[PDB]
Design a protein around this ligand. Structure first.
Ligand SMILES: C[C@H]1O[C@@H](O[C@H]2[C@@H](O)C[C@H](O[C@H]3[C@@H](O)C[C@H](O[C@H]4CC[C@@]5(C)[C@H](CC[C@@H]6[C@@H]5C[C@@H](O)[C@]5(C)[C@@H](C7=CC(=O)OC7)CC[C@]65O)C4)O[C@@H]3C)O[C@@H]2C)C[C@H](O)[C@@H]1O
Ligand SMILES: *[C@@H]1O[C@H](CO)[C@@H](O[C@@H]2O[C@H](CO)[C@@H](O)[C@H](O)[C@H]2NC(C)=O)[C@H](O)[C@H]1NC(C)=O
Ligand SMILES: CC(C)CCC[C@@H](C)[C@H]1CC[C@H]2[C@@H]3CC=C4C[C@@H](O)CC[C@]4(C)[C@H]3CC[C@]12C
Ligand SMILES: CC(C)CCC[C@@H](C)[C@H]1CC[C@H]2[C@@H]3CC=C4C[C@@H](O)CC[C@]4(C)[C@H]3CC[C@]12C
Ligand SMILES: OC[C@H]1O[C@@](CO)(O[C@H]2O[C@H](CO)[C@@H](O)[C@H](O)[C@H]2O)[C@@H](O)[C@@H]1O
Ligand SMILES: OC[C@H]1O[C@@](CO)(O[C@H]2O[C@H](CO)[C@@H](O)[C@H](O)[C@H]2O)[C@@H](O)[C@@H]1O
Ligand SMILES: *[C@@H]1O[C@H](CO)[C@@H](O)[C@H](O)[C@H]1NC(C)=O
Ligand SMILES: [Mg+2]
Ligand SMILES: [Mg+2]
Ligand SMILES: [Mg+2]
Lengths: 290, 32, 996
């Protein structure tokens, strides 16, 4: 006493006569609770579509992303040290490892689309009435001087920085480029009908530190995403689906100073959030120090 | 487009509800 | 070495009181007639200290605020906050979110502690204030005699051993040894507990200085007569000063409710550290570094702490205390509101507590028959038959011969509680006649008093003669009152129904046995007689003086007897009846004389009819008192003389083997010893009292109870509860209230404790299965302190599920506030169903937005990564940080809403511990409003504009609201059939395992 009750005649600490009763009760109880839970979760799983998600409204303004996703939006590396840029280089290697020409062999599941940006490819409806959909090919040659096949870079910006921008995948999304009536979109090509444009700037709307020269690699040479790869039909209907990529090389920059870069994708189907810096737009800080 | 939701309407509904529920609660605690 | 001091203070006192006055003055160095010299007086006055008590040693500063800030529970919240701050400090090892999370939490905990502390402090402060309004100290200047001259000086300037004169109405300045007296009755009522005024004389009477007549006492008022004495004791050295200092120096002891809460805390922290440790081990067993594992430990442990329960409990107690105050029952301390409900023994004082401490007419003798008068304060009793002429004659006798008259300002006042200038008996008689027979004003001035004889030093007969108001007989009327035996010696004729008679030994001894019966009843009896005069022999112009025998003092006409006693308060007997009915043992503890004590005891129901004391048995059987076996006696009157020679085992035995007990002639220290003796049995003791003799008792008791008006100041300071209206029946209400608020507390507790399973579990399986965090910190706070508050308070307004005053007092060791079964319900069963409901809503929302539950596993690593902006759902889509995070936070809001939804059912089922909800029912309005306001609040937080910006809470897509519903319904049905089976099978397995 008061407490030493651990064991005596006859109870196991605390009171051990009926322990089987209560343990059995909680096994039954928690078992039934688990069962009920799995039941509710099962009807819930009955109410979700196998093809399209029940709510798309959260991803509505798709985002712009970079290959070498950095610790915080920043590539800082030495042009000399091989181990300096190795992380970025490897990230790129594995990223585009999916895009190689021998990676798409099959004419069964792959389809060769235009060498020039083309109208959107609509395939049936989103049900399974039609078979597994073909996927339009993307050849790494569409990006020159950045991971183009064997020949060069290959230091992958080693001399001067370059980053590929990608558009976020959204099922059913059909990008509408800005009208030919477009308001002050800055230098850009006349391929506005079938391409979704992207452009980069040092600082957003205010005074800039601006130092840069940017060369863009698109499909056929146009700084944007070809509409022919849209809409995306989802992982089930289109596994091994390859989405468009577009390269941006910074040739001319001040080496030992860090500057910032924002890349905006323009369109009506496109939107931007001020709280989400990766929504509709893009941010990267780059310092190449030697 | 599926990418638009009416959040403002649902918002309004919830707020209207909050008002009604609360003032009804107030009717309840005052029984005269 | 104050232990020894208080050890000397718990011992009964001694004195020098028995001395030849020669030896007295020889010792004290004083003249008996002349007192002492002014020089000597001023010499002694500055030698030790002025005559007064040292002001109460307790003068805690408003810094006592800090007291409210700690306790045992606030402590739990303190260490909670400290742990939080420590966790954030450990999270200063990196760039970290808790700027909105852990720091927030700790600060909030601190805020709860501080605020609740402020509230409770303000309440107790308020009670202290309303108590301060009640203190009035009027300086009463003592009358001394120095250098032969009478001088009236401030009582504080009185020294040891100088001559003091006290008069009628004068309060005794310091402790005196009476050298001389004339007709002097001092009132010892508050100090020694003696009911009727005790006469004081030079002569030594009793060995115990408290009962002796040659000592007068500090703080006691002299009722009548005059006396001279030498001062034995001054200031703190006096009797009531020693009593007061003992009272100030005792210990409060831990209140029962506080202990229950302590134990409760032990439970909570028990499961807290079990979960925390076991999951610390578990976390290390997988991956996370000692850093993360520690953060998780602190996280879980703190998570198990009920922040809002402090508020809800404090508010609960405060509400009950509010009602108490409404009934004119004030509680000095906040937690003392419960104690009555836990009390198995009530030690009560007799005079001023159980009784009115006011001499009052009880029974009257008319036509050889006893008629009981109405002895109640409010006149709620039965009036006798006043139609008889004998009563008229008697009433005129009592009314006309007195020194008693109402004072100037008593008109509007009730005839009883109003003040009167005169003797005890004369006051009682005056009030009685003014009550029953009409006014004594025009009645006493109707007959004109010619020559009166005031009470004689010997034989104490008091007579007066008046003229005749009647229109028939112009005879002179003579009236006399006095002790029954002497007036029996002087009377011959007896009156019946308006016509006279001589005395025959049959009805003469009927009168004798009626006098001995009323006298044995505890009452004090007075013979009342009158005689007409032979106006032929004593003409209308004859002036009779007090010299020779003018009137025939013999052959008078004896009318009847009028007896009087201090009656119990009107509400008392019923109250004691209820307390006995509730299973509370009532013990009378008084310093009064045994003969009256036993009578009052039988009157108020402490000693029931038919129950015999050892002495009753001895008397009935005509046997020596020592013979009879004490086991045969259920009731006992324990004499205080014996109580001095008694040991621990002996007192234990007396308390054990006697059901109805009365301790009489007991010193205050012995009251303390009796209380401590009942506490040695391990039982909760409440003490009710009036005077200073109850100061050490009321202090030592688990709960003391004073009388707001009839109670003295010291005992009022010592009490944990005050009765402002002086209604004893309140005690009953008390033990009801405290016994109810217990049950409700459980419910409230249960409710809040149920919420901690669905609150903690999200962060648990967040660590385990590595899913995105289902429930945030802000949301958890919006449940604990946001919503559940109004329901948890509303649970306090729950009513009695059965008759509570029927059931026996709880056992402190067995029955607990928060025990095994409660935890096994809240944590084990209901809270689990709640958690499942929450996670269900979570998966509904996340699955509908494209992340299927099975895919959510291990995702958090990349999910909580700010810089991964391509994140694949089950449909192949790529989410940024803020998007999927917005979904997680719009998964927090519905988890919170779901908590509210299941807390509906939990609130309705926590409403009743036993009864089905269709019995006890929804008649609670505050509960209804609780539900409405709760739901409305949740809906607001969800849908108010900018809440996602502020609290990071987003508008619920409305169908989300229905995900929790079937789980709530399940909770309700389950606990309803549980509270069905418990009703049907009170064996019982469900009752033993669950019912709490
Ligand atoms: C070198 C590599 O280092 C790499 O650093 C890592 C390592 O340091 C590992 C490090 O682990 C985190 C991670 O597990 C996330 C994990 O985050 C969780 C723990 C801390 C929480 C703040 C947070 C939100 C809920 C919150 C807990 C803390 C608790 O105290 C609560 C206040 C508690 C409450 C009490 C109450 O009453 O109400 C609720 C229960 C739940 C709670 O509300 C969740 O907190 C842990 C500390 O995450 C860092 C990123 C980075 C790169 O990879 C780099 O290459
Ligand atoms: C990418 O880099 C190569 C360098 O290897 C460029 O070829 C150089 O092009 C410049 C003109 O811009 C010529 O003056 C040099 O003589 C070329 N050198 C070599 C070794 O080819 C190539 O034109 C660049 N292409 C793009 C699309 O940027
Ligand atoms: C009535 C009881 C005892 C039997 C079982 C019926 C249960 C499993 C039913 C009753 C209410 C139902 C839910 C109501 C809310 C909707 C939200 C919707 O967006 C997906 C399905 C979901 C989540 C339902 C699934 C099944 C549900 C939870
Ligand atoms: C007895 C039971 C059913 C009590 C529960 C009341 C339920 C049915 C109430 C309480 C909260 C309510 C909701 C509050 C928020 C609004 C938002 C509005 O835009 C659509 C409906 C909706 C979602 C309400 C529907 C009804 C609702 C879910
Ligand atoms: O079941 C609780 C619920 O019942 C009400 C009304 O339905 O009262 C019912 O039960 C009472 C028993 O005390 C009786 O008045 C009667 O049986 C019936 O009215 C409400 O008081 C309460 O909300
Ligand atoms: O239960 C049907 C009821 O809910 C509503 C909103 O009032 O549902 C709307 O919001 C839900 C949020 O999950 C959606 O599931 C639903 O598709 C949407 O219409 C109404 O539909 C209906 O009155
Ligand atoms: C590149 O930048 C350098 C200095 O910043 C400048 O001198 C040079 O002319 C630029 N090259 C162009 C404009 O082709
Ligand atoms: Mg106390
Ligand atoms: Mg008393
Ligand atoms: Mg909680």
């Amino acid at each position: 006493k008061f407490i030493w009750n651990s064991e005596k005649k006859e109870f196991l600490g605390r009171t051990g006569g009926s322990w089987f009763k209560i343990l059995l009760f909680y096994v039954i109880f928690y078992g039934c609770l688990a069962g009920i839970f799995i039941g509710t979760i099962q009807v819930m799983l009955l109410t979700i579509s196998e093809f399209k998600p029940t709510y798309q409204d959260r991803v509505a303004p798709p985002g712009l992303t970079q290959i070498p996703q950095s610790q915080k939006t920043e590539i800082s590396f030495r042009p000399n040290d091989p181990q300096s840029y190795e992380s970025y280089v490897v990230s790129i290697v594995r990223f585009l490892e999916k895009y190689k020409d021998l990676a798409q062999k099959d004419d069964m599941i792959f389809e060769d689309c235009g060498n020039v940006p083309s109208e959107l490819k609509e395939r049936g409806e989103y049900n399974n009435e039609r078979g597994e959909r073909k996927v339009c090919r993307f050849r790494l040659e569409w990006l020159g001087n950045c991971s183009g096949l064997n020949d060069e870079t290959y230091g992958y910006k080693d001399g001067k920085p370059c980053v590929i921008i990608k558009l976020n995948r959204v099922l059913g999304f059909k990008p509408k480029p800005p009208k030919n009536e477009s308001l002050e979109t800055y230098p850009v090509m006349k391929y506005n009908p079938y391409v979704l444009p992207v452009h980069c700037t040092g600082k957003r709307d205010e005074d800039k530190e601006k130092v840069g020269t940017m060369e863009y690699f698109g499909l056929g040479g146009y700084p944007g995403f070809p509409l022919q790869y849209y809409p995306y039909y989802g992982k089930l209907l289109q596994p091994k689906y390859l989405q468009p990529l577009m390269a941006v090389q910074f040739t001319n920059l001040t080496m030992d100073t860090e500057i910032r870069i924002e890349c905006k994708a323009y369109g009506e189907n496109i939107g931007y959030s001020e709280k989400d810096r990766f929504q509709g737009r893009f941010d990267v800080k780059i310092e190449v120090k030697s | 487009d599926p990418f638009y939701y009416d959040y403002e309407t649902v918002r309004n509904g919830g707020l209207i509800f909050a008002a009604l529920a609360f003032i009804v609660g107030l009717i309840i605690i005052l029984s005269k | 070495k104050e232990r020894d001091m208080d050890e000397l203070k718990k011992e009964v006192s001694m004195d020098d009181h028995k001395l030849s006055l020669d030896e007295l003055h020889r010792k004290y160095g004083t003249d008996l007639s002349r007192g002492l010299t002014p020089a000597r007086a001023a010499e002694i006055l500055a030698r030790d200290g002025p005559n007064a008590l040292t002001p109460p040693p307790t003068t805690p500063e408003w810094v006592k605020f800090c007291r409210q800030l700690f306790g045992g529970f606030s402590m739990l919240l303190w260490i909670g906050a400290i742990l939080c701050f420590l966790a954030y400090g450990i999270q200063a090892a990196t760039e970290e979110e808790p700027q909105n999370d852990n720091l927030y939490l700790g600060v909030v905990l601190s805020a709860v502690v501080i605020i609740t502390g402020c509230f409770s402090y303000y309440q107790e402060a308020k009670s202290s204030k309303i108590m301060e309004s009640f203190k009035n100290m009027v300086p009463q200047q003592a009358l001394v005699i120095r250098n032969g001259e009478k001088m009236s000086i401030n009582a504080e300037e009185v020294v040891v051993g100088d001559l003091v004169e006290v008069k009628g109405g004068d309060r005794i300045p310091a402790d005196l040894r009476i050298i001389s007296a004339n007709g002097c009755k001092v009132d010892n009522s508050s100090l020694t507990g003696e009911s009727e005024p005790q006469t004081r004389s030079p002569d030594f009477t009793n060995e115990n200085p408290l009962e002796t007549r040659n000592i007068a006492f500090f703080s006691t008022n002299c009722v009548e007569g005059t006396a001279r004495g030498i001062v034995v004791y001054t200031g703190d050295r006096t009797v009531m000063g020693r009593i007061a200092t003992l009272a100030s120096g005792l210990e409060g002891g831990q209140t029962p409710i506080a202990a229950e809460i302590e134990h409760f805390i032990h439970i909570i922290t028990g499961v807290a550290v079990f979960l925390g440790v076991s999951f610390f081990i578990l976390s290390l067993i997988l991956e996370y570094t000692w850093l993360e594992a520690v953060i998780f430990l602190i996280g879980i442990i703190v998570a198990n702490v009920p922040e809002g329960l402090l508020a809800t409990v404090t508010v609960c107690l405060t509400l009950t205390a509010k009602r108490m105050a409404r009934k004119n029952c004030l509680v000095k301390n906040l937690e003392a509101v419960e104690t009555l409900g836990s009390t198995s023994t009530i030690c009560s004082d007799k005079t001023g507590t159980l009784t009115q401490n006011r001499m009052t007419v009880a029974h009257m003798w008319s036509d050889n028959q006893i008629h009981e008068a109405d002895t109640t304060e409010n006149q709620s009793g039965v009036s006798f038959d006043k139609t008889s002429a004998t009563w008229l004659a008697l009433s005129r006798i009592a009314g006309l011969c007195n020194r008693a008259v109402f004072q100037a300002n008593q008109e509007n006042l009730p005839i009883l509680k109003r003040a009167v200038a005169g003797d005890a008996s004369e006051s009682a008689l005056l009030k009685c006649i003014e009550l029953c027979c009409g006014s004594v004003k025009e009645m006493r001035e109707r007959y004109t008093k010619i020559v009166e004889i005031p009470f004689n030093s010997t034989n104490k007969y008091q007579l007066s003669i008046h003229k005749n108001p009647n229109t028939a007989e112009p005879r002179h009327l003579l009236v006399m009152k006095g002790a029954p035996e002497r007036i029996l010696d002087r009377c011959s004729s007896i009156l019946i129904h308006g016509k006279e008679q001589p005395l025959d030994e049959e009805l003469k001894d009927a009168f004798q046995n009626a006098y001995l019966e009323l006298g044995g009843l505890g009452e004090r009896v007075l013979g009342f007689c009158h005689l007409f005069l032979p106006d032929e022999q004593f003409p209308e112009g004859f002036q009779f003086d007090t010299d020779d025998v003018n009137f025939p003092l013999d052959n008078l006409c004896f009318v009847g007897l009028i007896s009087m006693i201090d009656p119990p308060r009107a509400a008392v007997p019923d109250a004691v009846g209820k307390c006995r009915s509730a299973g509370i043992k009532v013990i009378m503890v008084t310093g009064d004389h045994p003969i009256t004590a036993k009578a009052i005891a039988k009157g108020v129901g402490i000693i029931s009819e038919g129950n015999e004391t050892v002495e009753d048995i001895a008397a009935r059987l005509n046997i020596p008192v020592s013979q009879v076996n004490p086991r045969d006696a259920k009731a006992c009157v324990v004499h205080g003389s014996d109580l001095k020679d008694m040991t621990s085992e002996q007192l234990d035995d007396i308390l054990k083997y006697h059901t109805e007990i009365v301790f009489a002639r007991t010193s205050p220290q012995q009251k303390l010893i009796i209380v401590e003796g009942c506490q040695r049995q391990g039982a909760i003791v409440a003490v009710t009292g009036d005077g200073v003799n109850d100061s050490p008792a009321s202090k030592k008791a688990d709960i003391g109870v004073a009388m707001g008006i009839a109670g003295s100041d010291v005992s009022k300071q010592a009490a944990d509860m005050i009765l402002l209206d002086d209604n004893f029946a309140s005690i009953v209400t008390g033990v009801e209230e405290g016994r109810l608020i217990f049950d409700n507390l459980k419910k409230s507790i249960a409710y809040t404790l149920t919420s901690n399973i669905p609150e903690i579990t999200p962060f648990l399986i967040f660590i385990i299965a590595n899913i995105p965090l289902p429930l945030g910190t802000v949301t958890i706070l919006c449940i604990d302190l946001g919503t559940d508050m109004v329901p948890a308070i509303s649970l306090a307004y729950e009513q009695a599920e059965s008759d509570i005053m029927k059931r026996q007092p709880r056992n402190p060791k067995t029955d607990k506030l928060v025990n095994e079964q409660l935890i096994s319900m809240a944590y084990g069963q209901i809270g689990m169903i709640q958690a499942l409901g929450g996670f269900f809503t979570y998966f509904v929302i996340l699955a509908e937005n494209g992340f299927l539950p099975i895919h959510l596993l291990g995702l958090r690593v990349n999910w909580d990564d700010r810089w991964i902006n391509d994140v694949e759902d089950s449909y192949g889509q790529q989410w940024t940080y803020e998007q999927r995070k917005i979904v997680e936070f719009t998964c927090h809001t519905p988890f919170f809403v779901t908590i509210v939804v299941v807390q509906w059912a939990d609130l309705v089922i926590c409403k009743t511990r036993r009864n089905s909800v269709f019995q006890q029912g929804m008649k609670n309005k505050i509960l209804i409003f609780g539900l409405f306001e709760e739901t409305a609040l949740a809906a607001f937080l969800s849908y108010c504009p900018g809440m996602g910006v502020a609290l990071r809470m987003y508008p619920l897509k409305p169908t989300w609201w229905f995900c929790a519903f079937p789980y709530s319904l399940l909770i309700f049905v389950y606990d309803e059939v549980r509270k069905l089976i418990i009703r049907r099978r009170p064996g019982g397995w469900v009752e033993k395992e669950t019912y709490y």
